Point group: C2
Chain length 417, copies 2
């Protein structure tokens, strides 16, 4: 068996995507702006904020051994310097639920959404962000740090560098004013549009430095409470490929998005790898590539072979233990998700059988949810939710993966201790 | 007793003062503005949002038969036209807890705090405000109306008029810009200050018409779900008195603040009376306490005889049943509170005994809480909360009044 007994089998969520009523967040604010690129508001999402106990019990019943979720800074520090012990107690009860159900909690301290007030100090390019984040992380540790299994500081700091290569984003700061969304944003924040920089859109050297310092200062804050607790960030590392004409563009992208962040990870306990497919570049940049085999729901290629390739890359470049903190598939046909997961798990086993220190596998996502700018259309969940009633119904993929996890545990009788 | 069989004995709260994290409300926003008049932010308050079950068990264990609390528009409709079913289920659970503990729930549909977005459309001077408020009251009824024991549409529409008589607000709208907090509110909302009108500061003719229209449209929305449910609004009615020199001033205030609103109440099923003390006017306007006892934490005269007066007044002007939806005392010494509640309650019984139809007594307030611009200084609670730990400790007044109910 290539998986060790302590290997984590989980599903992941992000607070804004499942909790509902993240009304103090930047993303919420962006969802309701006149010029918005968000297709619909998050609203209640799946109401994980109130239903987490039953959600945890469901997940643990399916045989998962871990649960990854975010603590939301927008709730914890709702205005700069005014921490909410009430919200911190909410997340302590979440962690207590995990622990009562045997789940190791993988806590993401930040998952794109920020308190809206942060966007007035320059957001993820502001020089105070690294220390405010770190202060924030110390406060969460102060209140519930003993209950965390594993810590992820930041989710996908490199995402917008990859989106820029499409590229959706990455206007120059001096040009953010010309996209409606940013112009509006700045106006109501009472601030200049060149200074508007939520986490997931910022691909600027300022933003690189701010992200890295925030990671660094947060790790230290966290270690001050639990020196034993393993910490890393997570990366949006695709399997980068090319066709003829795209070799140099592919190389540039692999370098700026993947290797640069993995180089920056080399001090850490682990790195989180988040991978869905390959990303192919030709002479005109991004090519949704040649066709076969997705047909994902978004019309992207179904290529869970990517995971094994990014795990290998991460081991090579960073040389630290890897945890797969996201992996999954957007599809309305769950039989495709099952076949995808079989292959991705094979990818993991294959890396482990080669001596790569992989420490868990966490599927994106637990429940069909708010897929950022595309809203509720894209279905990534291993568990269905009828949002109108909030009823949860596990899909076969949840039973398959859950039961795979369960079937890796030893089976010995009790032994005098 | 002269208390009928089904007289309600309650304690009351307001969602902004007790729940914590009312981050989408207009008040929250005003608490954090640069030139704010709020002495401190509400923050977590006493975290009633999370602890309500324990709070209601405690309330019920003490002997009360009723609980008055708000549902917060700021959480139910966080953006105009976007209702939260999860916020509605929360409140649904609050009502289920009440009933599980045998407590008749008295729900206030609005208790000063509004969604921040409402302030961008002219707030409680906004001409769409009545129909928005009614629509909101409808959604709440659709989700949970069957669990409400009594309904209070609006809390103290008339408060800011009373305060104006102390020269404490009531700038004409053209001069709102001159108050720092309004100028800051304006700038952050992208709106002119003349337009900024949160409920409890708005004592303008427009705000009278808007409040009244909202109360009426809300009443009609709630009866479309529950024609049996008793509906009214609550009034900030002091026992307005004079000394020689103050007669015209006193009559004026009595007419604009109490009688005008009681007249406006004449169609309703009951009027909620909220009274704490007397307000005395002399030749120089509002008079300070005499070399006359106690006094309360705010230096106002401790005057429980006020309640009997405002009940008699309401019966006379409105002519409909009276519910005491707030009465109590701000004080650090609870022995003063016990004595106050005893006499107030005697005042109520004396009204009852004269045939005035009083339907309930509800004390302000369950828990020491966020007293608006005064922050956590003032202690009105029958139950103490050490906010650092959120630990609840019933004062003697809790056990006194609870036990009084229990007979």
């Amino acid at each position: 068996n290539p998986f060790p007994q302590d290997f984590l089998w989980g599903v992941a969520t992000a607070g804004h995507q499942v909790e509902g009523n993240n009304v103090n967040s930047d993303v919420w604010f962006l969802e309701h702006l006149p010029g918005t690129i968000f297709a619909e508001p998050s609203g209640d999402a799946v109401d994980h904020y109130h239903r987490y106990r039953e959600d945890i019990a469901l997940i643990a019943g399916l045989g998962f051994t871990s649960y990854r979720f975010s603590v939301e800074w927008a709730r914890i520090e709702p205005e700069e310097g005014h921490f909410s012990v009430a919200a911190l107690d909410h997340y302590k009860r979440v962690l207590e639920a995990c622990r009562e159900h045997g789940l190791t909690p993988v806590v993401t301290f930040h998952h794109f959404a920020s308190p809206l007030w942060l966007l007035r100090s320059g957001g993820w390019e502001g020089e105070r962000t690294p220390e405010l984040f770190a202060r924030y992380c110390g406060r969460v540790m102060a209140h519930l740090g003993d209950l965390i299994g594993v810590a992820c500081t930041l989710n996908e700091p490199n995402l917008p560098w990859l989106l820029e290569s499409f590229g959706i984003g990455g206007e120059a700061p001096e040009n953010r004013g010309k996209v409606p969304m940013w112009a509006a944003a700045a106006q109501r924040l009472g601030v200049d549009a060149s200074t508007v920089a939520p986490f997931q859109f910022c691909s600027t050297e300022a933003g690189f430095n701010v992200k890295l310092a925030a990671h660094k200062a947060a790790t230290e804050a966290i270690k001050a409470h639990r020196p034993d607790l393993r910490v890393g960030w997570t990366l949006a590392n695709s399997d980068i490929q090319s066709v003829p004409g795209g070799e140099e563009i592919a190389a540039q992208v692999r370098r700026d998005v993947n290797e640069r962040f993995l180089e920056a990870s080399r001090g850490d306990d682990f790195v989180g790898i988040q991978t869905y497919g390959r990303t192919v570049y030709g002479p005109d940049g991004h090519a949704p590539a040649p066709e076969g085999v997705a047909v994902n729901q978004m019309g992207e290629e179904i290529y869970p072979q990517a995971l094994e390739a990014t795990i290998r890359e991460a081991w090579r470049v960073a040389g630290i233990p890897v945890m797969v903190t996201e992996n999954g598939l957007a599809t309305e046909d769950d039989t495709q998700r099952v076949a995808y997961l079989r292959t991705a798990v094979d990818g993991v086993a294959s890396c482990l059988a080669d001596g790569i220190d992989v420490r868990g596998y966490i599927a994106w996502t637990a429940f069909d949810n708010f897929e950022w700018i595309f809203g509720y259309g894209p279905k990534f969940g291993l568990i269905a939710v009828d949002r109108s009633t909030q009823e949860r119904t596990p899909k076969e993929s949840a039973r398959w993966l859950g039961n795979f996890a369960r079937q890796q545990a030893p089976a010995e009788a009790p032994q005098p201790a």
